[PDB]
């Protein structure tokens, strides 16, 4: 659902910074993710303590509801949940938009001498828009 505009040619400094690399994370720490994934995939092995956060709780229910009767290996389900739920970053040379949905297609939109104007399909984050509005 992406849209392509023109390619332009110019020199631009691509400055190295840390950027987000996985759109759709739920901004959990690894211990909150673990806690959640334990509840979702292996509930009876949770141990003593349980989830304070309400974010944790509504994710759990959603995921728990999405993945009932699931016969894909629990290893892959936990692996994917961990990849999805935790914010991951990387240092990349990046000239333009730093949002994760743009980072994801950096190889496509940015070259040494070119920009391929592009808009990914889907909604922006309200956070990203607010941030861009200020800039």
């Amino acid at each position: 659902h992406g849209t392509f505009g023109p390619v332009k040619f110019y020199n631009q400094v691509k400055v190295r910074k840390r950027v987000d690399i996985n759109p759709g994370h739920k901004d959990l720490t690894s211990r909150e993710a673990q806690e959640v994934i334990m509840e979702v995939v292996f509930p009876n092995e949770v141990g003593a303590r349980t989830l304070s956060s309400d974010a944790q709780l509504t994710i759990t229910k959603e995921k728990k509801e999405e993945l009932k009767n699931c016969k894909i290996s629990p290893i892959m389900v936990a692996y994917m949940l961990e990849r999805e739920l935790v914010r991951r970053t990387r240092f990349l040379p990046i000239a333009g938009a730093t949002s994760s949905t743009y980072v994801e297609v950096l190889h496509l939109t940015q070259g040494t001498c070119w920009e391929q104007q592009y808009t990914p399909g889907g909604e922006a984050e309200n956070d990203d828009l607010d941030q861009t509005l200020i800039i």
Binding site: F4, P6, V7, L108, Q116, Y118
Partner: protein, 49 residues
């Protein structure tokens, strides 16, 4: 006890000097022929400009 039992030869290589044939080979390597030597596999269709 074998008298000539000895460590394997472990010396520097024998030296050799430049000859004209290597430059000549390289000249020929950089030249056009009238054959296409490399066949490339297919790509997905081009979409982005």
């Amino acid at each position: 006890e074998v008298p000539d039992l000895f460590q394997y030869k472990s010396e520097p290589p024998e030296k050799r000097k430049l000859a004209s044939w290597i430059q000549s080979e390289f000249n020929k390597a950089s030249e056009l022929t009238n054959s296409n030597w490399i066949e490339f596999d297919e790509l997905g269709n081009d979409v982005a400009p």
